[PDB]
Amino acid sequence: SKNVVIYADGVYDMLHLGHMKQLEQAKKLFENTTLIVGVTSDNETKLFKGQVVQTLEERTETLKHIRWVDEIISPCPWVVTPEFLEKYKIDYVAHDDIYAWLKRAGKFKATQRTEGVSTTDLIVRILKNYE
Amino acid sequence: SKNVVIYADGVYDMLHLGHMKQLEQAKKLFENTTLIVGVTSDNETKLFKGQVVQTLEERTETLKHIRWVDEIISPCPWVVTPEFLEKYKIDYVAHDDIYAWLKRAGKFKATQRTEGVSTTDLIVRILKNYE
Numbered sequence: 001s002k003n004v005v006i007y008a009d010g011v012y013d014m015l016h017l018g019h020m021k022q023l024e025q026a027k028k029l030f031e032n033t034t035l036i037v038g039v040t041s042d043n044e045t046k047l048f049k050g051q052v053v054q055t056l057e058e059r060t061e062t063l064k065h066i067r068w069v070d071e072i073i074s075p076c077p078w079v080v081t082p083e084f085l086e087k088y089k090i091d092y093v094a095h096d097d098i099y100a101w102l103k104r105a106g107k108f109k110a111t112q113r114t115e116g117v118s119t120t121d122l123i124v125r126i127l128k129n130y131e
Numbered sequence: 132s133k134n135v136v137i138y139a140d141g142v143y144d145m146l147h148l149g150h151m152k153q154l155e156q157a158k159k160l161f162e163n164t165t166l167i168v169g170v171t172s173d174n175e176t177k178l179f180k181g182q183v184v185q186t187l188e189e190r191t192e193t194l195k196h197i198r199w200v201d202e203i204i205s206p207c208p209w210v211v212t213p214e215f216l217e218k219y220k221i222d223y224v225a226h227d228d229i230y231a232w233l234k235r236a237g238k239f240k241a242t243q244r245t246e247g248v249s250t251t252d253l254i255v256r257i258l259k260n261y262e
Contacts (some may be wrong), residue, residue: 014253019191020196053257058148058248065151117189120220122145123254126184 009038026094029070038076140169157225160200169207
């Protein structure tokens with residue numbers, strides 16, 4: 001069966017069960033996939049999104065331990081371009097209009113988030129040992 | 132090359148880069164390994180060790196996403212017994228005297244911890260945005 005190249009990008013700050021469920025979903029979009037994961041740079045995340053607690057090196061070294069991940073681009077470009085897809089032979093971009101041109105080319109696959117499971121939520125759970 | 136069965140157990144509460152480096156180390160003790168990971172039960176961890184923030188289901192569902200892990204025993208027995216090793220065809224127990232009988236049988240492989248990388252340490256890093 002023919003192999004399909006899948007690209008997911010994101011911050012992957014303090015990786016939790018919600019990220020790994022996302023990655024798994026992207027990896028199993030097809031029978032034979034190569035999941036490529038892009039890890040956004042510290043300064044671009046700072047500028048365009050918000051605070052990130054872990055460095056690019058930390059966030060990438062963690063992703064290396066997740067099973068669904070076949071290749072990592074670190075740092076990845078903030079915006080996905082058509083030439084980026086050709087350069088890495090990417091068949092689909094997995095994400096959860098800005099991505100409008102990806103849908104138009106048939107190259108967009110949606111995947112779900114999972115709430116509650118996040119790292120910040122776990123501290124709230126430690127803290128509710130007190131009143 | 133002959134396959135070797137490796138067993139690591141622990142709490143794996145709020146899995147961080149230090150755990151995954153431990154698992155990877157255990158998995159690469161030999162060329163062909165099966166890494167079996169044992170996840171201690173909520174009540175035994177409570178009793179014998181301390182507070183654990185994540186449930187057995189949560190801690191096990193996270194380990195399922197780590198690459199080095201081939202099999203999970205959940206919950207695992209708190210103490211490793213000789214009959215436990217025979218039942219699962221375990222050749223070595225990976226851990227960081229109590230384990231004295233494992234060394235005597237040639238069944239103990241040491242692996243290292245990695246400090247600083249822990250989940251609790253990451254919140255301390257968020258908090259040092261203030262004085």
